[PDB]
Design an enzyme around this catalytic site. Structure first.
Site, PDB file in Angstrom:
ATOM      1  N   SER B 197       0.845  -1.199   0.000  1.00  0.00           N
ATOM      2  CA  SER B 197       0.000   0.000   0.000  1.00  0.00           C
ATOM      3  C   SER B 197       0.882   1.250   0.000  1.00  0.00           C
ATOM      4  O   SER B 197       1.703   1.417  -0.900  1.00  0.00           O
ATOM      5  CB  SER B 197      -0.936  -0.015   1.216  1.00  0.00           C
ATOM      6  OG  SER B 197      -2.068   0.811   0.992  1.00  0.00           O
ATOM      7  N   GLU B 324      -9.043  -5.120  -3.622  1.00  0.00           N
ATOM      8  CA  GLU B 324      -8.422  -3.985  -2.950  1.00  0.00           C
ATOM      9  C   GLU B 324      -9.395  -2.981  -2.313  1.00  0.00           C
ATOM     10  O   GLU B 324      -9.102  -2.414  -1.263  1.00  0.00           O
ATOM     11  CB  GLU B 324      -7.528  -3.231  -3.943  1.00  0.00           C
ATOM     12  CG  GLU B 324      -6.430  -4.068  -4.594  1.00  0.00           C
ATOM     13  CD  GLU B 324      -5.272  -4.357  -3.657  1.00  0.00           C
ATOM     14  OE1 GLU B 324      -5.298  -3.874  -2.502  1.00  0.00           O
ATOM     15  OE2 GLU B 324      -4.325  -5.056  -4.077  1.00  0.00           O
ATOM     16  N   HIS B 437      -7.532  -6.026   0.985  1.00  0.00           N
ATOM     17  CA  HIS B 437      -6.353  -5.176   0.918  1.00  0.00           C
ATOM     18  C   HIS B 437      -5.462  -5.515   2.115  1.00  0.00           C
ATOM     19  O   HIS B 437      -5.924  -5.514   3.253  1.00  0.00           O
ATOM     20  CB  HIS B 437      -6.806  -3.722   1.009  1.00  0.00           C
ATOM     21  CG  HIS B 437      -5.700  -2.724   0.893  1.00  0.00           C
ATOM     22  ND1 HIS B 437      -4.949  -2.573  -0.256  1.00  0.00           N
ATOM     23  CD2 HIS B 437      -5.266  -1.774   1.758  1.00  0.00           C
ATOM     24  CE1 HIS B 437      -4.103  -1.568  -0.094  1.00  0.00           C
ATOM     25  NE2 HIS B 437      -4.277  -1.067   1.119  1.00  0.00           N
TER      26      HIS B 437
END
Lengths: 532, 532
Positions: B197, B324, B437
């Site tokens: 991320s 995600e 995610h």
């Protein structure tokens, strides 16, 4: 005599014609207007003056002056659409097929031919109404109307070439039917007008136009609707094109009076030879002289009329063919050929998109291209070819008809929708063209019932089902037989949006015909072009 | 002693820790910068002054001051990401896991945690580097960096709060590794930085930034790239947000000097309590204080840097998770709930779209909605929910990473792409969220190898394959074993664009990861928003 009919315009003498080993009466070339020649060119039509004696209606009339396709000399595929009679500006006549013995008061069907408003004839072999008149026992009428500049040259503001006179020709023929079909055994209160392409657009236009509405009962629209992007133009674009036409023939352009007078002195073929030079853009599926939103025939914009319910409320039956666009790509898009598979490259695909949506800015062209491209396989020649075929068909025929049906159904009294996806076994056009624009006509007029034309048994059966759907709808306002055991063609409603496929397979009902693309063409793209 | 190491900053005392019935050395909380406190808040970091004596590195350091998620008190799903140590502005430390016996010169992997640039800790249970260090025999390093306003407040033009100081913290830690990892058995010329991320975005940023490039050899980016729409802002937006922050704390706004001084007098939690109030739009997946295109750390715009090849050329391994976006919808979009299937209506779908693409005008919102709606079934709650999940993921993570990979690969020396689509069997989050995610992290750090955590045998095997891919890539620049018989992870090339799936099923190679949508998000939409 069965062949002698006394109408309000005078007496008419028909002829007996053989059909499927039987016979019916035919009255060909009945005049419904004064010949629009000389000073009458471009003018609204005038009623035919009554005649003494007997009008000989045993032979087809002339075809209106028009552009003639010579792209494939000899080829039956294209020549079956060309005029099969001498062309003449003296062409406002109609044809009637009457069952034998002559009916007392039966259902009437009036056919309006297509041809992009620049061509067409009521005398083509595919439009022979004897089969349908005989098989379904209806009075079949086919009319004619001026096309090209002769029927649609529009210089709004002047009464010498007001525009839409081609539509007025149709209306005049409908007026004659209303006033005289009773003498041929037809019920004037039960007339269904039906047409294909420009003819389908015409039918929709009579539904919208206040002055035509009372002249018919029901309507059938085949692959064409009034709101199609090619079916009409503004008075401004009409004026611009009329002036440019005059410029190609070196005419005096100082006044409408001057332009019109100069145009009336030209031989018919002289206007025809330059007709295509006035289009504003390099394009496909766009015609020079078409109907114009004048404020008279059409009170306001077509969209506002559809939104306010400003139109005849009755029952309608309509639909489209699977591959409406292939014909226009073959003739005008780079990469397509009649004798090859026409696999298209990325280059020609985008070249084709630009030609199909001529009014689009760059952002618009990109939207279309993204919408019809499979990026996991973008150099696939067959996908690009079919993608282009879909674009032309969706934008020009299918999506505009879906917009119409959905708008109409909110105020109408019954809608029936079809999707014709059967490719005739004897088609002479290549395979890549698929279910071609206009080839459902032969099934509607019943050509498959004649052994010598070489259709299969399932195609003959398909033709009878279709002829029976069309005629039953014309008579009752519902294509289905009341107490039949056959599969039922459901009614299209605002909620379910059901429609049926039309082929030789067992009836299958579906919903929301090409919705995904129609939302793109009817809601998104217009919004994009208006904001950018 | 194995636990005693003499670095250039001073001596350090580590601790022996058990791992899978064996042991390795751990050096926790090694300082790499002077504590950024008081007058140093918002400033670029300064090297840690050398120390005499032995630094006790047997326990984890504090976590940087940050926002703490309390949306689900007690819930392990969310609390596993919260700081597990006391928060303190004194938090610039790094951790090292060294195999036993201590290597002489082995491959080094430096982990950079994610957290949207507003949160994150190097001490989370999921980031325990002992498993990976032990199993693959590598020196594992995890660093820390300031987040939120403390690490990214940006008032360009002043040296007191220039911005990007959080990235400079990372760079400083990398500088320490380069200068000292040799004493721990690591090869400073073979260091691979990897992150997830914001950490993945950070890795990409060091690849781009001239001042960071020489500090590492290779790179791995997990679900994040430098060009993500949430990863950076202009100096103007940075300035605007810094001023608004000051406004929420009633600060003197006449000069940067005044604003900065007032902000330095505030307790950490005071800036944190109002941090979210400065976002320009009502939105999802957008964070307040993030990196800024300043002209120093980043010479020019990121797009021009990617186009001109202005970046470190080496090998990279990167990829994304299947879902995600679900995490950000659960927390901020109407209709989503942790304890329900979250079927979304048409109303909330469009509400969600507006929140996901905050910078879009109406035409833009319509483009997105059309692109992700199935009009044959628009009121399907599950389709709308998944459609929204895809939008958030495609726009924020997947499409930006694909743009990066394609741009990078033109100048790089080798690219390897993956698509992680395995949902852990022991996930506590609901099913509708899918492959969440950040949940590929546990497989990378090898948590499935510990029986007590309750993973399946196939998940343990999957973890070993992944750890071996990551470590082999770190060592050689290729995730595959030279003469192995196992399935080969193909190289991603500009032409084929191959990638592999990462799950417990037999390796499957694919091409053009979500191309259709990526062309929409990377080519079409930006063009639309710029023209309209």
């Amino acid at each position: 005599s069965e062949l002698l009919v006394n109408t309000k315009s005078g007496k008419v003498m028909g002829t007996r014609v053989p059909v499927l080993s039987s016979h019916i009466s035919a009255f060909l070339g009945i005049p419904f207007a004064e010949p629009p020649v000389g000073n009458m060119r471009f003018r609204r039509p005038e009623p035919k003056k009554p005649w003494s004696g007997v009008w000989n209606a045993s032979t087809y009339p002339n075809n209106c002056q028009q552009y003639v396709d010579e792209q494939f000399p000899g080829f039956s595929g294209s020549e079956m659409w060309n005029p099969n009679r001498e062309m003449s500006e003296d062409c406002l006549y109609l044809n009637i097929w009457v069952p034998s013995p002559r009916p007392k008061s039966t259902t009437v069907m009036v056919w309006i031919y297509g041809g992009g408003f620049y061509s067409g004839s009521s005398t083509l072999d595919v439009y022979n109404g004897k089969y349908l008149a005989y098989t379904e026992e209806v009075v079949l009428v086919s009319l004619s109307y001026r096309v090209g500049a002769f029927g649609f040259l529009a210089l709004h503001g002047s009464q010498e070439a007001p525009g839409n006179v081609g539509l007025l020709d149709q209306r005049m023929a409908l007026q004659w039917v209303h006033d005289n079909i009773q003498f041929f055994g037809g019920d004037p209160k039960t007339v269904t007008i039906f047409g294909e392409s420009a003819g389908g657009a015409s039918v929709g236009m009579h539904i919208l136009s206040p002055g035509s509405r009372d002249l018919f009962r029901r309507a059938i629209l085949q692959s064409g609707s009034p709101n199609c992007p090619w079916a009409s133009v503004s008075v401004a674009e009409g004026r611009r094109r009329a002036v440019e036409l005059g410029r190609n023939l070196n005419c005096n352009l100082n006044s409408d009076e001057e332009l019109i007078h100069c145009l009336r002195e030209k031989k018919p073929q002289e206007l025809i030879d330059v007709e295509w030079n006035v289009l504003p853009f390099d394009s496909i599926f766009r015609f020079s002289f078409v109907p114009v939103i004048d404020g008279e025939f059409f009170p306001t914009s077509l969209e506002s009329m559809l939104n306010s319910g400003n139109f005849k409320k009755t029952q309608i039956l309509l639909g489209v063919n699977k591959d409406e666009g292939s014909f226009f790509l073959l003739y005008g898009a780079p990469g397509f050929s009649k004798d090859s598979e026409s696999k298209i490259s990325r280059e020609d695909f985008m070249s084709g998109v630009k030609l199909s949506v001529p009014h689009a800015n760059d952002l618009g062209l990109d939207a279309v291209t993204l919408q019809y491209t499979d990026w996991m396989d973008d150099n696939n020649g067959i996908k690009n070819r079919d993608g282009l075929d879909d674009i032309v068909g969706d934008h020009n025929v299918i999506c505009p008809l879906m917009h119409f049906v959905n708008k109409y159904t909110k105020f109408g009294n019954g809608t029936y929708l079809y999707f014709f996806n059967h490719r005739a076994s004897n088609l002479v056009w290549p395979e890549w063209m698929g279910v071609i624009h206009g080839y459902e006509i032969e099934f509607v007029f019943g050509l498959p019932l004649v052994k010598e034309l070489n259709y299969t048994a399932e195609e003959e059966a398909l033709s009878r089902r279709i002829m029976h759907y069309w005629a039953t709808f014309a008579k009752t306002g519902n294509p289905n037989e009341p107490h039949s055991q056959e599969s039922k063609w459901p009614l299209f409603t605002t909620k379910e949006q059901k429609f049926i496929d039309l082929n030789t397979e067992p009836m299958k009902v579906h919903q929301r015909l090409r919705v995904q693309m129609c939302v793109f063409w009817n809601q998104f793209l217009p919004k994009l072009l208006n904001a950018t």
